[PDB]
Write a protein that binds this ligand. Structure first.
Ligand SMILES: *[C@H](C)[C@H]1/C(=C/c2[nH]c(/C=C3N=C(/C=C4\NC(=O)C(C=C)=C4C)C(C)=C\3CCC(=O)O)c(CCC(=O)O)c2C)NC(=O)[C@@H]1C
Length: 315
C-alpha cells in the first residue's frame, strides 16, 4: 500500500496549489488542485480548466518567465520563480519539476512586501546557511555529538521551528533523538527511541531523492487534484513541495503535538546511506518560504559531507 499512496496519493496541502502543464510549449493544463482558482483569486470556460493555457493564469511578465523556465536545459536552476496571478497581482514562489506527463508547478503564496524586502529574505537565507556551514567547518574534529548539537542550533535559528532534532537510524532501523534544540517550555525528546515501523521503508527510501519535506498543518483538509481523463493513474506528486502527508502520519503528528514539520535527509556513503533525519516540529501551523528551505537543503548536504568524513575516518 504505502509507496504508491505516497507517490500518487492525489492530494496536496491547502497552503499552496499545484498545476500539471504540457511540456510541448502549449502550456495546456493537464491537472490542477481543486483550490487553484480560489488561491489565484479567480472566483466561455474558466481560466482554471483542463486544456486551458496555464500562462493566462499569471501576469504577462510572469508568462515570459514560465517560457524561459520550461525551455531551459535544467528546470531546477531557475527555482523558485517570482510570479503574479493575472487578476489580483497576488505573488507566488513557483517551484517546477518534470514528471512522465509534463511539468508540475507548485505555487506557494509569497507574503507581499516590495521585491527588495523579498530579495533581502532570500539573500539572508542563502548567506545564513553558508555562515552555518562555516560555523560547522570551524568545529574541532572527532566529535559527532558536537556536530549534531551545532546543526540543530543553527537549523532552529534559521527556521524558527519550536523543536529541531537529529534522529539517527540504528542498524535495526529504529531511531533515537541524538540531538535537540527546543523552546525551553517544551518537554525534551532527547534520548528517546522510536520503533523502525514509525517510518516505513518507502518513506526512508523517498528521502534519498526528496531531501526536504514540509507539512504546514497536520489538521488541514487535503485538496484533491482534478486531472485529464486521458491520464491512466493519479498524477505523480512524489516531487511536489505541497504533497499531502499519508493519513496515518497526519494522525501520528496530531498525537505527537507536531502541528507542522520540516524533515530533511542526512545522506552519507556505504553506496549513499540515509544515516538520519533533521526533524523540525511546531506546536502551531508553519510554512517557511522556499528560499529558506533551499538554504537548509544545502546546509544538510554540507552537514552530510562533514558527518561522512568524521565516520569513514573510526572506519
Ligand atoms: C501508519 C499506519 C504508520 C506510519 C506511517 C508513516 N510514517 C511516515 C513518515 C514519518 N514518520 C516519522 C516519524 C517521526 N517523526 C518524529 O518526530 C519522530 C520522533 C521524535 C518520529 C519517529 C517521520 C519523521 C516521518 C517522515 C514524515 C515527513 O515529514 O516526511 C509516513 C510517510 C508519510 C508521507 O506522506 O510521506 C508514513 C506512511 N507511521 C506510524 O507511526 C504507523 C505505524
Amino acid at each position: 500500500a504505502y509507496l504508491s499512496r505516497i507517490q500518487r496519493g492525489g492530494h496536496i496541502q491547502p497552503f499552496g496549489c499545484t498545476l500539471a502543464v504540457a511540456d510541448d510549449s502549449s502550456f495546456r493544463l493537464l491537472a490542477f488542485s481543486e483550490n487553484a482558482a480560489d488561491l489565484l483569486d479567480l472566483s466561455a470556460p474558466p481560466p482554471v480548466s483542463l486544456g486551458a493555457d496555464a500562462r493566462l493564469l499569471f501576469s504577462p511578465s510572469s508568462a515570459v518567465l514560465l517560457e524561459r523556465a520550461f525551455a531551459a536545459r535544467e528546470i531546477s536552476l531557475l527555482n523558485p520563480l517570482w510570479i503574479h496571478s493575472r487578476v489580483s497581482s497576488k505573488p507566488f514562489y513557483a517551484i517546477l519539476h518534470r514528471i512522465d506527463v509534463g511539468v508540475v508547478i507548485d505555487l506557494e503564496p509569497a507574503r507581499t512586501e516590495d521585491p527588495a524586502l523579498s530579495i533581502a529574505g532570500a539573500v539572508q537565507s542563502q548567506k545564513l546557511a553558508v555562515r552555518a556551514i562555516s560555523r560547522l567547518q570551524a568545529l574541532p574534529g572527532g566529535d559527532i555529538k558536537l556536530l549534531c548539537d551545532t546543526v540543530v542550533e543553527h537549523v532552529r535559528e534559521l527556521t524558527g521551528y519550536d523543536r529541531v532534532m537529529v534522529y539517527r537510524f540504528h542498524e535495526d532501523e529504529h531511531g533515537e533523538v541524538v540531538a535537540e534544540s527546543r523552546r525551553d517550555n517544551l518537554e525534551p525528546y532527547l534520548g528517546l527511541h522510536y520503533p523502525a515501523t514509525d517510518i516505513p521503508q518507502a518513506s526512508r527510501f523517498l528521502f534519498r531523492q526528496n531531501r526536504v519535506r514540509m507539512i504546514a498543518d497536520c489538521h488541514a483538509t487535503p485538496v484533491r487534484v482534478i486531472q485529464d481523463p486521458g491520464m491512466s493513474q493519479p498524477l505523480c506528486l512524489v516531487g511536489s513541495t505541497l504533497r499531502a502527508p499519508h493519513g496515518c502520519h497526519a494522525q501520528y503528528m496530531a498525537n505527537m503535538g507536531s502541528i507542522a514539520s520540516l524533515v530533511m535527509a542526512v545522506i552519507i556513503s556505504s553506496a549513499m546511506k540515509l544515516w538520519g533525519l533533521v526533524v523540525c516540529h511546531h506546536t502551531s501551523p508553519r510554512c517557511i518560504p522556499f528560499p529558506l528551505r533551499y538554504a537548509c537543503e544545502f546546509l544538510m548536504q554540507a552537514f552530510g559531507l562533514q558527518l561522512n568524513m568524521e565516520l569513514q575516518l573510526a572506519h
